[PDB]
Amino acid sequence: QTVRIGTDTTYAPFSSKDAKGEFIGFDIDLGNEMCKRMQVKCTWVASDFDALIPSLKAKKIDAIISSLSITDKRQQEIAFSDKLYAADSRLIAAKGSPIQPTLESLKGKHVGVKQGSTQEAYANDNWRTKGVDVVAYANQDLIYSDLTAGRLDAALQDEVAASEGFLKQPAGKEYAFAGPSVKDKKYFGDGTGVGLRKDDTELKAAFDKALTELRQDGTYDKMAKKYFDFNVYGD
């Protein structure tokens, strides 16, 4: 009757907190709208990103809505709803930096990634092994802070989150994307979705039906235009 939804609230404009601590963003909007149509009450539960899937398995939450990319490896552990939106990854660095998302360019440099994320996996496999100082952070706010402090040369995260939550904000005015999106289907998955226990067939079916329903009547686009002047859903 209650659905507990875990989210990492340091990933604007998808999941973050306003000045009085209330959860805000597109993930929150999608979650609340789906639960409205499911006719369920929903409790939001703030969590570090890397604790979300462990908390879901332990039954401390019932769903994850936290820009959780749908990947082959994660599907071995949990189930996913249908796609909520697309999520490409992209590097950011200081404006005018020559940095590229390449080993040759990042060797010896300090690159921040969120612990537990697809970006940490990609960076650990392709960069950390090979001499890039990949630094793994409990949350994304610590990454932005350490980047602006000049402790990081660059940071890898979801492209829309970096753009709307940092680059277009006053904090990130002197920073820019370094190179194009990092395209690696294996690592970064096929968009984001609601993360669910594999046996929670009924819950997944309910989320899927509300999501189709709010996409069909135009509610998705209404909510998306609050944050985005582009097609965040993808293909």
Ligand SMILES: NC(=O)CC[C@H](N)C(=O)O
């Ligand atoms: N909330 C997030 O930081 C999610 C990051 C990334 N899309 C992942 O799934 O790993």
